[PDB]
């Protein structure tokens, strides 16, 4: 069946944004959304993430962290 290209991008253009990008759309918690950027912080070292992830992901995640530090009413800070 299907299997890596090992000589092209497509395989990992499609990677870097497959559920990453929606982990953090569906974050519902900057505290989360922090502990998915210590994640990727953790993760990126462990593999490679190209430009294309940090740019297309990053943006998104501090994307929502604004959105998020807006919404810092989070749990025993606020209850």
């Given amino acids: 069946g299907s299997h ?6 497509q395989f990992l253009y499609e990677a870097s944004i497959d ?3 929606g ?3 569906s974050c519902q918690t900057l505290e989360g ?3 998915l950027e210590a994640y990727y912080k953790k ?4 593999t490679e993430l190209k430009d294309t992830d ?8 501090a994307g929502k962290r604004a959105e998020l ?3 810092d ?7």
């Fill in 4 to 9: 890596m290209l090992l000589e092209f991008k």
């Fill in 23 to 25: 982990k953090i759309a």
């Fill in 69 to 71: 530090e807006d919404s």
């Fill in 33 to 35: 959304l922090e502990e």
């Fill in 54 to 61: 940090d740019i297309s992901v990053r943006d998104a995640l």
């Fill in 73 to 79: 009413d989070e749990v025993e800070e606020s209850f």
């Fill in 43 to 46: 993760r990126v070292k462990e």
């Fill in 19 to 21: 559920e990453f990008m």
